[PDB]
Amino acid sequence: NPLVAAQEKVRIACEKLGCDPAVYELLKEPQRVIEISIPVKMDDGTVKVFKGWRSAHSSAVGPSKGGVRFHPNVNMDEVKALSLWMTFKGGALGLPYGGGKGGICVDPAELSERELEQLSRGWVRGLYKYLGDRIDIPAPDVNTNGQIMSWFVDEYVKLNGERMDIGTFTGKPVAFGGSEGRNEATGFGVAVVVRESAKRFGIKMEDAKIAVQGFGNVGTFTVKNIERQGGKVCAIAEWDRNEGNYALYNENGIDFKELLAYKEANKTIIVPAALENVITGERAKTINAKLVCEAANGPTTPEGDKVLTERGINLTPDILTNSGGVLVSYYEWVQNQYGYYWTEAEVEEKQEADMMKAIKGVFAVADEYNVTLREAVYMYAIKSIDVAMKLRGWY
Amino acid sequence: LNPLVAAQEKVRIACEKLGCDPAVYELLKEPQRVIEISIPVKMDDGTVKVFKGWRSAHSSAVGPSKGGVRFHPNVNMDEVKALSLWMTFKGGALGLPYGGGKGGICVDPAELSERELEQLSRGWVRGLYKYLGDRIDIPAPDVNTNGQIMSWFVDEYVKLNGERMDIGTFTGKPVAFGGSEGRNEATGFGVAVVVRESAKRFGIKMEDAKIAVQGFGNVGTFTVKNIERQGGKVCAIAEWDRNEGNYALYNENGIDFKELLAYKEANKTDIIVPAALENVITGERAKTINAKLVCEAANGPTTPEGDKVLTERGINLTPDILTNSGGVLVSYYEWVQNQYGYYWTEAEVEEKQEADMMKAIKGVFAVADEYNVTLREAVYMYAIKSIDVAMKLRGWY
Amino acid sequence: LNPLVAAQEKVRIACEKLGCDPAVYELLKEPQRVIEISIPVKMDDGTVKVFKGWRSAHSSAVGPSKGGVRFHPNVNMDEVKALSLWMTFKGGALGLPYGGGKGGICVDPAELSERELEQLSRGWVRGLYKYLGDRIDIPAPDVNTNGQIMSWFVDEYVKLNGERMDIGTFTGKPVAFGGSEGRNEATGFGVAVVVRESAKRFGIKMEDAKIAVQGFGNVGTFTVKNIERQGGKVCAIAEWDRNEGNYALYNENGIDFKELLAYKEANKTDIIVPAALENVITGERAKTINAKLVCEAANGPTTPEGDKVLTERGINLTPDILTNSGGVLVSYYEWVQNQYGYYWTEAEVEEKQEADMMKAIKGVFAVADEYNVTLREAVYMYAIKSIDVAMKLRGWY
Amino acid sequence: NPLVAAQEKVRIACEKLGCDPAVYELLKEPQRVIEISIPVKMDDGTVKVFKGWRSAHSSAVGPSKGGVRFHPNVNMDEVKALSLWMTFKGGALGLPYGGGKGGICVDPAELSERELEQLSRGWVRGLYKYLGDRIDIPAPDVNTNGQIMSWFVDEYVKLNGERMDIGTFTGKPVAFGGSEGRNEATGFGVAVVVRESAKRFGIKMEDAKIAVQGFGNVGTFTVKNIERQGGKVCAIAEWDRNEGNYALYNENGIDFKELLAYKEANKTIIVPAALENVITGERAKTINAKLVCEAANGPTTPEGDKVLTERGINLTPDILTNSGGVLVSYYEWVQNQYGYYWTEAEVEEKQEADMMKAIKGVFAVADEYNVTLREAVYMYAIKSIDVAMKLRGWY
Amino acid sequence: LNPLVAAQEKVRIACEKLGCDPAVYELLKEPQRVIEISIPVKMDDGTVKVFKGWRSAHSSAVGPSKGGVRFHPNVNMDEVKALSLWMTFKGGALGLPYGGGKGGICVDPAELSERELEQLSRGWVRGLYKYLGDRIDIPAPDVNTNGQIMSWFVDEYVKLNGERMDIGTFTGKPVAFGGSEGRNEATGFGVAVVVRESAKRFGIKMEDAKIAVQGFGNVGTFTVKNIERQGGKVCAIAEWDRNEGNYALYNENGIDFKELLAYKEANKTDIIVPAALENVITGERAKTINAKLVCEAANGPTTPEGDKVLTERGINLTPDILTNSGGVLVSYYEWVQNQYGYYWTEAEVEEKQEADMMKAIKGVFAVADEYNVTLREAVYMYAIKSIDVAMKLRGWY
């Protein structure tokens, strides 16, 4: 199922680009998918075998890269679809990668932490020959973190002739060859994307106030960097239990510094963070903004997008706006390659440079093929993936 | 219906009568590794069509993985998964130092040009080579593949393998290119051996009871041949045309194999050995039968309903998996010869082939005598039993 | 005292009577390579204990390194260094294409849980794998290790080896997992062969002179067996209990091996073959003895003081290293079978085993006849002589 | 013998940190030590076999790194101990390495220079499979230099499938992929460390005059950079033969420029360069300074340290103060990895940045665990090594 | 003149009478790969002289490449290219799973010290090792090289090969270092076998017709030996001195090999077998001859003018390439033994050697009978024919 959606993005993109039919044919599906049976000797002394996958969607432009999921919903079609999405996520930035992804159909909640390690090691032990800092680079996704990555790296090295190719997995702890600027990367990304969009649509940052929906990891750090960049946020929005779907508002902007401080202790234009499918056809018709900046994946439905265009509202698409995270993930890999590590300031400096480069591209394409930013970003990714496949002789 | 369940059920049933640990089934339930690839072909008209391909390593418990590659349009992930499980059985039955593997490409090779076919074959290797090798996983021919495809496989593989000619990474090669003697008539030789030892063990003397062979295909051709080669002879054949359905020649004293085969050139046309097709010997054919012994040469000819009456009617049965395993036995020999690069003669191959068939027979019988059950349920048990030991020793549970 | 000196002295003495170059001793003085590792184990209670482990490659002059792994609490670097030197001898004595190697872990495996024991074993491999391989260095069982540890060794090694099943990287495996037939009774078969050829060469006919075997352990059990298998027979045994010390049965005409072994089940209880322990045959036991020939089956039973009187008393002696080398001979065969992956039968293994023992015997005798000295000092010379040639050819001096 | 001393540093450190008992157990001893017999066909046509070692103490944090010794005193226990010291030396800086070291029990004085090469090549030929720019990286120590490193690299490459992983050995000549800033690195390090210490203890550099004991390689270049950094040295100190234990003093600072010039031609607060165990209990009680900056390894004895604390005298420990050398050694390896080479100015710029980062860390720890700089630096190293071992799953 | 043209012409002529595809010649026209290296030697006086060296892989169509290394001052790229082409023939003639390879160093080893010679040899390997290996390309001795150089080759190669002792990467090793029995007298044994089967096929009984051997070199020594070993005997020899030119002993009844060889120690001095030199049997020597059969043991003794009259005079001729191929046959066996690391006895080597020579003879004859032409033009056709099949299967055209 989930594959059609992403195939669609390609063939729509390819359709407006006018590229060769091979492009779609080659991009239609992953270059390689491995499915393995990972036995775990469970704590009670038992064996349960868990299914795992890694799907390399593309290596046209560079080595493959994307995260690993420990969900019970993951199956081959999930990973196939998700890795295709990755190829977009990457090319959008113009990174020298292609899409990859993996997962294990597990409920990690059911597992002991030695059991969980054994599974993680067992995953690598199943695929290592098709992984490496210049083949395919896994990273965290749902239910995985720097702890799993650290287990992945340990076992990988052992398998790898002891050569510490630590950039074979990103999303590592700084304590173990990860990178600064990680945790607040995406939020920093969004804030940069907001300013340049506004600037390009004739809006001055310090001069128009802003609404951010949701205050998770993204959100928290997008309001932060809006302040860091001379702007400020009047309307937030958030959810509880205990009310649900509520909204803060302390007038000439909510102080991020002091609001964040209250999440500790209390645990309690438009940027949607938080959840998907908020902003549907009949939600879009109700608001008042000249610009929408998607920070969450999803927000606007294909129906919503339609009215925005007619209502005269511009929209920067998730894939671009929230790509700072993977941008920083890429930096981590770079630092691993020559083994020199950057500072938070150095990471931000580059992060701003590169986001702006990617923005410039998506805009240039929209201006040229005369269409939406959402349909431009996907075209930007396909366009450069196309060049590489043709050069390499794949068609 | 999903082909895996049948394969899995054979495991479930075998493990159940063996009394082995529940992990055994859990570990054997599914392949250790399956790779699915997208193989692009630049077609002759200058076009790209991408074909899906698979290799499924079912098990390496006992040794490296081994099994054939299919170029059918019906092949999909479930096919290969199931098939490779069947291979694990096929192998263990003989007690070979392998595990089951299999691969395929969803293609209609008929639709392909022969440079297109090569590019596909090379493209298949180029997709998986890192999980292939004479000591990882060894592909061989299956439906729509032959020694020509293997030869393309080997060429591309060597290129990818740092130029080291590990030619035993693919079996079913031509003699002209590091294949082995005794190949073409291996299975037929196999079944004949098994026919004699079965009879002997069930109190039947070979030269002393006449025999029926259903089918005179490759298998049948060479099974009647070696029955003659081993002192016996075949009275009743059986075969199909177009132009008249199931017929059965019967020249009483037997009919020469030598003269009969000679007439298939030019003309193009006690106990029992079914060759040819499956699902002969249904419930109501197994009532009409008059024999003390059935020797399966084709895969199939067992309606599990048929098996039931045979047991009550007092008729013994040697199961395909064992009886027709000479082919893979010889495929194994090829791999051996590739490893130290010394090549055996047709006579040397047969000598070993007899030795080893007899070893495997003795094993299946010993098990049947011990766990007090059918040869068919014994052979599967024989395979699981030894796969089990290895998994335990290796620490898999 | 440092176990190396004894091993080294054997080199010093051999080189001295051979007249070989001083480099020979200098090069053989010590292992080419010793790795010492810290193996962490996450203990069952959730704890970490780190165990020291070693592998010592003494020599690869003649071929890859080979020797067993010890799980004793007494093992230390000097043990392994010395032991691996002894292996170089053990091997060359037979004229095998190996050099000496050995390893160990300073552990009391008794103190360990069996998942703990596995993690240790796997952890040992994980520490050294880059200097192991079927053509670098091949570990086997020694004290407190068996085919179970080898099977764990092999599993982890394969994982580390890019999934290539080079199973001949460890010998002493179960038949069920690529081990070899003839293993368990190899040494016993060995000594029996040597017993006959020695006698023959010293003018004694096998069926024609009765024999004494000290000890009926594994070794002794299978040495009396094959003495019977080879036309001879044993009158006097000898054994130990708890519950009465050194006793010796003597059923004159000989006593069946067949019936005797059968009584060890249920009951749990001319010339000479010492099995069992070392330092039997002291100076004052070698005065009381009445035999024309001694065949060492145990390592040890030579007080160098004892050897002295035997020579003057006119008593010949085949040294352990040669007489009991059938075990490693069969360990070698296993490795061979692993290389081309074809497995030999117990009969095929014995046939070769006899052939090769006789080849090695002939060599040791030829040397003794030439350099005009004892079999014990001849065997060590035999080993050094061929190791020497290789070092010279290879350009090591 | 020499091992207890270093084990002690760990268990004292671990004791005040409060880390898990596994930490000490795992750090107690090297992860791997190889002992080899290196035959040399001597010039007269003879064979002498020399013993050699490489001890990888730790790779927790990164690949192993440390030097090779050609002394007759080197034995397994030396190398074990020394590689443990390396793990400290490294982590002190927070470098992505762990400790390694090697040696050959030889008197290189007894050897011809073709003999010496044959030994050096023979050393690599003995261990190469456990060396590499991402396993274990050897460097010079006593009796070894860039000439030995160059022999190591030549043979290594040959063994390595011809792949020029030249960062497998550091301390190479600039002429062969070494790095600028090498020779005067440690001296540059010390000078930086002096200024920041003073600054943190309320002393202005140009404003208080300084004593440096010894004028070797260190010393020479520490007075140099003191001048380079606005300070200046009044009292030196040095040794001859021919007097021994003497001291210069040309008043408002000795001109480094002109003094150095006189070593050519003539061959003839507190920074001890030169030798060990100067500053014992009864030497410490005799001087007058608010700060001691160890440039030599050793100076202050456990007895001396005691009175300094009570007498109110602060002390920056060798391991930190003199670590610029290895800092630059690390840079060399970085440059080897992507094959771009830095300038002396670029090396110094980074060198100052990173020393200051490491200083900041050691101070932060001392301020937190409320103890001496000497006991803080060792704690700093263990602390980060600890995190990595736990992440990687080693306990 | 360029040595390649002669080699190439043999291909051109063979392909022409076979009727094979034009690609066959195009692909075989030249080596697949030639490496030329500059080997620096630090000379004893402390100096540097750089020697040129080559390895030329002509073909790997059928298997890995194999052929010897030359230390002559005449060796250049064209020599090695041509020579390796000749190797492809030499090999295929026997039907071995190899292709042709060859190497050399333009040196006068006479001018070299023996540590200098070693450094050169090691330096040669160090230059090419990545395109050598027991399954890529296997070097052996040729002019001015022996088992000593091979032993240096092997030592350096192992070092470069991650310490894996793939010793079958070089053949022509000493028995003392993984060489093979039967080596030294292989070719002589070869020619004797071929002598008998030729005679038999041309209606001549061995014990029943006396024989002439030109030359009593290594080849000749062991060809008269095995003629005796096979029931025949030699009347006329022939040999050269200094001190009198071409002479020929004739002790009628034959003259013992045993006693004759014994006199070469101390003294240092029907149908026909030329050993020794080439270009004996010119046009005007082939008119003066009285024999029904010529068996070439030396490479050469065929003025293509000579061949012409032999055919018309009615005299049959077995060509060098086939007759003297026992040497390389045994070189192959060595490689086999290295692969699984089990070593054969001189008797076992001869047994196989006879079997395989007879197989190759049978092939060359079958071809000659089919394409109705000379044995000399048949053997080359035999080699091309099987190389052809492989190239086609592998997809090379």
From Swiss-Prot, chains B, C, E:
E.C. number(s) listed in UniProt: 1.4.1.2
Pathway: Amino-acid degradation; L-glutamate degradation via hydroxyglutarate pathway; crotonoyl-CoA from L-glutamate: step 1/5
Binding site for substrate: K66, K90, S331
UniProt xrefs under Pfam families: ELFV_dehydrog, ELFV_dehydrog_N
Active site as annotated: K102 (proton donor)
CDD domains membership: NAD_bind_1_Glu_DH (cd01076)
Catalysed reactions listed for this entry: L-glutamate + NAD(+) + H2O = 2-oxoglutarate + NH4(+) + NADH + H(+)
UniProt binding sites for NAD(+): T187, N218
UniProt-listed SUPFAM superfamilies: Aminoacid dehydrogenase-like, N-terminal domain, NAD(P)-binding Rossmann-fold domains
Superkingdom per UniProt: Bacteria
Enzyme class: oxidoreductase
Family (UniProt): Belongs to the Glu/Leu/Phe/Val dehydrogenases family.
This protein's name: NAD-specific glutamate dehydrogenase
Organism: Peptoniphilus asaccharolyticus (Peptostreptococcus asaccharolyticus)
